[PDB]
Design an enzyme around this catalytic site. Structure first.
Site, mmCIF file in Angstrom:
data_model
loop_
_atom_site.group_PDB
_atom_site.id
_atom_site.type_symbol
_atom_site.label_atom_id
_atom_site.label_comp_id
_atom_site.label_asym_id
_atom_site.label_seq_id
_atom_site.Cartn_x
_atom_site.Cartn_y
_atom_site.Cartn_z
ATOM 1 N N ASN B 180 101.604 -9.487 57.949
ATOM 2 C CA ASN B 180 102.248 -9.987 56.888
ATOM 3 C C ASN B 180 100.776 -9.740 55.495
ATOM 4 O O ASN B 180 100.154 -10.746 56.370
ATOM 5 C CB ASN B 180 103.314 -10.484 56.550
ATOM 6 N N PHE B 187 103.078 -9.490 65.649
ATOM 7 C CA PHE B 187 102.713 -10.066 66.943
ATOM 8 C C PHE B 187 103.740 -10.725 68.383
ATOM 9 O O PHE B 187 104.553 -11.027 67.617
ATOM 10 C CB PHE B 187 100.939 -11.786 66.309
ATOM 11 N N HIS B 200 105.348 -16.062 58.827
ATOM 12 C CA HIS B 200 105.479 -14.880 58.997
ATOM 13 C C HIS B 200 107.129 -15.254 59.928
ATOM 14 O O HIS B 200 107.888 -15.963 60.110
ATOM 15 C CB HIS B 200 104.727 -14.626 60.086
#
Lengths: 101, 232, 78, 437, 106
Positions: B180, B187, B200
């Site tokens: 982000n 990922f 995240h």
């Protein structure tokens, strides 16, 4: 069908007496292609078996496939190392006997 | 865990034969058979995707080494919470399949977005895109299927969507997390990355093919890493 | 957060393309990019002091998108 | 109101509470174990777990981490059990409605707060993980129940009573340790070898106060055990047994402080004017004495523990005693759950006292530095968060006030209606008369 | 969701005492679409009814030390393994599979 079974024996508390929980907690097997060797002839597989102190061991498998089963157990997921190891190996750690089939 | 590899197929076997041979185990969503356009014949193998992973499992057990059109076939995994896959190519070489479990129970909107981007059912997705940022012992980042450099991507909801929650933490390798302002970039972790906790959204995990993720990490990119195929 | 640590760089980079580079995000007030004397070349890791902390936390968020010589750039708080 | 729904919600809440205190008993088995052990010595019948379990702090296979917190959770479980008892009590004591349920159809509301607000209302306060206490008992504080010298049930503070005792004996020949030696007296000693004459006023008063203390301490340190049960047990033992004291020589003693040859004369003495008088005047005291007795018996381990503490502290040095006190203090006020150029600075203008008012009435030691304050993170945060936008314009004045009027200093067409009077009329107004026309 | 909840719980109240609903469905609406096991909410329905069915059980007082004992027994009623597995993966990944010294073949 027909399958292979190996019975590997280990030391009788002869040298393992000198135990610091360093991976002391089983032997591991892997299928290796002879395409890579320290490179003369090749073209067959080996059922390598390894343990920390002792030396590696190999067994030639000319047959393309033997005992390669189909969903033996009911899909339980503790991968350990791989499907091969959990699927078909036993480690009698009390007697130090590694069975593979 | 819904996609199976099926090899040892005789020339007469086609998608119809496969459908008929595997449907006894459960409903099937897709059947792919790579073809050689010079010959117009298949290459001896195919991928069969079941609706349910449990059915795919029963099929593996009963069909592996069974007979089809006179010869022995080979069946195995090719690579309630959705499971998806990505087939990875590194340089010009297939690397294998990563299978992932999406945590729809914890982060439904985030899981659904990634699921749709694997299937392309909303008209766009990950197939043919790259892992454009790969850092050894850290993570492999992809999903930028518009700009291919970390500046692009889009979700199924629009350009961006909210952080659902931070319940799932970056506890080790093989976890899926959103890059982000969530869009499509994500990922795969290559170690514990706890400094990203609360920043995240973690939304899934690798269930098969950690070794393929390690091959991606090995390029951290020194060679192109491409999502050759993907789906559910 | 006022300072960041930056890894993975190529010595053709110097203190100037860091100056220019991170002020693209927000101004680097104090730059530190070691010059090694012995062999006269850079290892490629950096420390950055900003005006205050907000600059540098936004810097944590945005900051690790920089790619120096085709290659990845580490930015973390310090 | 359909009673079915109410009774349902009741059984459900009861279930929720049981589940909560069960989760607790799960994370730290000690919670139950501790409790149960004490219970063992009050109600002899009680079956207690295998010792191994207790020690290894495990309930089945997994040995849990050893844990002020134990006591805390025990009092929390206490209030939980109170709630449960209440609900159990009240509990012991179609188209028509479905039609009215259609009422107010148009509400844009998400409703996920019945079982979640309850489940949550009773689970292991903070944002994520800071306080073990549940929302149910968020204002529960042990330090308002235990003093620092008691260490949440570790010791019982008897120094105070040693003071009062000195005041009672009218001398100073009595040391803290000799006082504890006196307490030890408390099935026959406290009765036949009394520190003072049991008909002495000062003495009986003291004994009352002390008894009360010991009892409150007892139930305070063991929330989990049913207080009423214990009370009633003791009371019945008092009434039914306490010619309970018998001697093969002197016969039967009476708490009249006299013995009696046989049970016969003992019985015909329990109706006499003497015994009526005494049992009618000294009843409360006798009963309190008895309670002091049995409660001190139930707390033998704590009594010993404290006496030990006393001897230790006593045999300390100055530094030792001080550090120990430090320790008791820390235990008391701790969370129950852990997470040269001299002329150069004058020349350059630095190390001179100065102040910025808008920033925390902050101090600055140099004029160049304060001139650098004008462009800063915090300074701009004070401005912008204050509502005064950050720009040079304001890069001078410090006081919060003046820049407010400065910022006030910082921060109409004619559309011609048809009657030729609308040359004063605004655009939007004439558009409104477009909608009207 | 108050509407849905209320209708589920009401039809559950009546369904707890099963003919009134089977008649309502034929008499009246896409409102009671949760009656079919197809509609997800149906499951939760099966819960509520059961619960109400339970209230009909001891319609008898509850006179429950015991509560504590019970909660203990409920309490009574993996990590390490994961760790060991991890170790194994590490070592397997970290040994020379090229140090061959075979004996026979099958």
């Amino acid at each position: 069908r027909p399958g292979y079974k190996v019975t590997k024996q280990r030391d009788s508390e002869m040298g393992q007496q000198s135990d610091y929980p360093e991976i002391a907690e089983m032997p591991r097997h892997r299928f290796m292609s002879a395409y890579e060797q320290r490179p003369p002839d090749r073209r067959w597989q080996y059922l390598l078996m390894a343990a920390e102190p002792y030396e590696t061991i190999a067994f030639k498998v000319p047959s393309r496939e033997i005992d390669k089963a189909e969903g033996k157990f009911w899909t339980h997921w503790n991968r350990e190392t791989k499907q091969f190891f959990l699927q078909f190996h036993f480690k009698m750690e009390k007697p130090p006997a590694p069975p593979s089939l | 865990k819904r996609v199976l590899y099926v090899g040892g197929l005789a020339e007469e076997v086609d998608d119809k034969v496969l459908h008929a041979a595997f449907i006894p185990f459960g409903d099937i969503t897709d059947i792919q058979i790579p073809l050689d356009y010079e010959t117009e014949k298949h290459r001896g193998f195919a991928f069969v995707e079941f609706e349910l992973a449990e059915d795919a499992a029963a099929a593996i057990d009963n069909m592996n080494e069974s007979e089809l059109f006179g010869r022995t076939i080979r069946v195995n995994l090719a690579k309630s919470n959705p499971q998806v896959y990505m087939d990875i190519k590194i340089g010009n070489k297939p690397a294998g399949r990563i299978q992932m479990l999406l945590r729809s129970d914890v982060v439904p909107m985030t899981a659904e977005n990634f699921r749709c981007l694997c299937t392309h059912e909303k008209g766009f997705g990950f197939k043919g895109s790259s892992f454009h940022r790969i850092i050894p012992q850290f993570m492999c980042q992809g999903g930028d299927f518009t700009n291919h450099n970390g500046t692009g991507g889009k979700s199924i909801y629009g350009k961006k969507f909210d952080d659902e929650n931070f319940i799932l933490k970056h506890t080790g390798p093989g976890l899926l997390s959103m890059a982000n302002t969530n869009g499509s970039q994500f990922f795969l972790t290559c170690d514990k990355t706890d400094w990203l906790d609360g920043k995240h959204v973690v939304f899934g995990e690798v269930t098969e093919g950690l070794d393929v993720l390690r091959q991606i990490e090995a390029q951290g990119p020194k060679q192109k890493v491409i999502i050759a195929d993907c789906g559910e | 957060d006022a300072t960041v640590y930056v890894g993975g760089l190529d010595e053709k980079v110097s203190e100037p393309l860091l100056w220019e580079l991170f002020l693209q995000a927000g101004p680097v007030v104090n730059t530190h990019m070691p010059k090694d004397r012995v062999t006269g070349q850079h290892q490629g890791y950096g420390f950055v002091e900003f005006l205050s902390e907000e600059d540098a936390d936004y810097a944590i968020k945005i900051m690790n998108m920089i790619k120096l010589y085709g290659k990845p750039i580490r930015v973390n708080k310090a | 109101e359909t009673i079915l729904e109410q009774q349902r919600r009741y059984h459900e809440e009861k279930e929720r509470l049981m589940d909560v205190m069960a989760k607790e008993m799960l994370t730290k088995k000690s919670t139950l174990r501790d409790q149960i052990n004490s219970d063992h010595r009050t109600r002899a019948m009680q079956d207690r777990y295998m010792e191994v379990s207790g020690n290894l702090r495990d309930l089945y296979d997994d040995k849990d981490g050893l844990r002020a917190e134990f006591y805390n959770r025990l009092k929390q479980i206490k209030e939980f059990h109170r709630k449960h008892p209440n609900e159990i009590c009240v509990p012991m004591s179609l188209k028509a409605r479905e039609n009215p349920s259609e009422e107010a159809q148009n509400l844009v509301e998400f409703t996920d707060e019945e079982g979640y607000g309850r489940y949550l209302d009773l689970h292991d306060y903070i944002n994520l993980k800071a306080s073990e206490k549940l929302d149910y008992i968020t204002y529960l504080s042990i330090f308002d129940q235990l003093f620092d010298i008691p260490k949440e049930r570790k010791n019982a503070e008897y120094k105070r009573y040693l003071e009062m005792l000195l005041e009672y004996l009218q001398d100073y020949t009595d040391r803290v340790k000799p006082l504890q030696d006196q307490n030890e007296l408390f099935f026959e000693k406290k009765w036949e070898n009394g520190t003072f004459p049991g008909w002495p006023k000062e003495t009986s008063s003291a004994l009352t106060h002390a008894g009360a203390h010991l009892d409150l301490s007892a139930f305070s340190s063991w929330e989990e055990l049913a207080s009423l049960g214990l009370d009633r047990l003791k009371s019945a033992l008092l009434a039914l047994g306490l010619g309970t004291l018998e001697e093969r020589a002197q016969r039967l003693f009476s708490t009249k402080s006299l013995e009696s040859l046989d049970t016969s004369l003992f019985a015909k003495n329990p109706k006499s004017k003497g015994t009526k008088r005494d049992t009618e005047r000294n009843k409360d005291i006798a009963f309190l004495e008895a309670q002091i007795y049995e409660y001190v018996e139930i707390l033998g381990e704590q009594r010993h523990l404290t006496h030990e503490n006393v001897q230790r502290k006593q045999a300390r040095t100055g530094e030792e005693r001080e550090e120990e006190e430090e320790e008791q203090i820390s235990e008391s006020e701790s969370e129950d759950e852990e997470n040269i150029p001299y002329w150069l600075y004058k020349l350059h203008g630095l190390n001179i006292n100065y102040n910025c008012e808008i920033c925390g009435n902050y101090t600055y030691r140099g004029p160049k530095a304060f001139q650098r304050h004008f462009a800063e993170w915090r300074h701009a945060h004070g401005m912008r968060c204050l509502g005064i936008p950050n720009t040079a314009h304001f890069a001078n004045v410090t006081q919060i006030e003046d820049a407010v009027s400065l910022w006030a200093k910082l921060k109409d067409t004619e559309e011609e209606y048809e009657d030729s009077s609308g040359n004063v009329v605004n655009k939007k107004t004439y558009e409104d008369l477009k909608r009207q026309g | 969701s108050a509407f849905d909840l209320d209708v589920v719980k009401l039809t559950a109240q009546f369904v707890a005492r099963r003919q009134f609903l089977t008649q309502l469905m034929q008499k009246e609406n896409y409102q009671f679409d949760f009656l079919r096991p197809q509609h997800s909410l149906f499951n939760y329905f099966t819960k509520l009814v059961e619960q109400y069915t339970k209230i009909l059980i001891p319609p008898s007082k509850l006179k429950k030390r015991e509560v504590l004992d019970q909660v203990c027994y409920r309490v009574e009623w993996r990590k390490k393994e994961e760790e060991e597995k991890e170790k194994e993966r590490v070592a397997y990944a970290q040994i020379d599979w090229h140090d061959f010294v075979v004996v026979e073949t099958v």
